[PDB]
Amino acid sequence: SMKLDIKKTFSNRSDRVAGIDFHPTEPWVLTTLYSGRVEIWNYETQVEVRSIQVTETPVRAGKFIARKNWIIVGSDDFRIRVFNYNTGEKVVDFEAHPDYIRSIAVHPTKPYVLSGSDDLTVKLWNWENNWALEQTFEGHEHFVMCVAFNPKDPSTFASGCLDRTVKVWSLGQSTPNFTLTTGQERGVNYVDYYPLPDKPYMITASDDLTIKIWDYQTKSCVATLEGHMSNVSFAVFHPTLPIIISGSEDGTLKIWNSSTYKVEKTLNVGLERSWCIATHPTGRKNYIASGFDNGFTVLSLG
């Protein structure tokens, strides 16, 4: 067991941060900004590794593809771009959807990337097939806000949608395995998987102020977490600690106990609205990072 002991590792002021991600083996965080800029920071030495003026439009989605030394970003010009973060070379640059890109997910073992879009679809791209579009998942009836592979079975993934559903799909299958009606009448902003095999759980966040935990075997709602006072931008399970982290346009991060679902901490990090979240994939120092209107902060949770 490990006690909560929150330490501010690194904080950096900037334009609004829309996407944020951890590098799995370097002490780096990637941020994608509403200004069209993206930055990689070493949060342990507090040194900027690289910055790129990618576009003039907001860059909403960004992920490391560490095993190719890439970052992949999606922006409101409808385009996916890939950059080598060691050289700055632009690897590819294509219009992926005819509308905004909301979310990007990277398959852990196969050369697949998912993009969720306001065009009501999720699309699957294969970078070992010249970034071919291998599948478009159709069936949602509003903007697809968030996509996430099941870490315990990456042949499936979940899409959260403003049509108030989460759909779980299988690669190569045109119809979803199942559709969760969330009861979150304002729609689903975010979806995330519980990482460990002891619970088949998922978590959703909504503008209706609720965070809901779902059992994807029983398709039932396990718990509803209330406490935020404005739109909940995200909610995720921590990969190694028994906690949930959420962030809201009310300016706060909340840390919840993942067994009792009681709020343990409410943090005003002082950067106004909270928009995005990342956790270190292997729990290194239990790092988390969140992007806000006015920058991002990296915290060690214990």
Residue numbers in the entry: 0 to 301
Tell me, in the authors' exact words, what the paper reports.
This challenge to normal metabolism is overcome by the activity of the cytosolic coatomer protein I (COPI) polymer, whose repeating unit is the coatomer, a 560 kDa complex of seven distinct gene products (α-, β-, β′-, γ-, δ-, ε-, and ζ-COPI)25–31. Overall, the coatomer functions to retrieve the escaped “client” proteins, such as type I membrane proteins, from cis-Golgi back to ER by retrograde trafficking. In particular, the S protein – a type I membrane protein – is delivered to the ERGIC from both the ER (by anterograde trafficking) and the Golgi (by retrograde trafficking)3,10–12. Here we utilize recombinant SARS-CoV-2 S proteins and tail peptides, including constructs with enhanced mimicry of the coatomer binding motif (clientized S protein), to elucidate the atomic structure of the S-coatomer interface.
Therefore, we expressed and purified an alanine substitution mutant of β‘WD40 Lys17, which is juxtaposed with αWD40 Lys15. This β‘WD40 mutant demonstrated a lack of binding to the clientized Thr1273Glu S tail heptapeptide, which is consistent with the loss of binding displayed by the αWD40 Lys15Ala mutant. This showed a rotation of the Arg15 side-chain reminiscent of the conformational change reported above in the αWD40 Lys15Ala mutant.
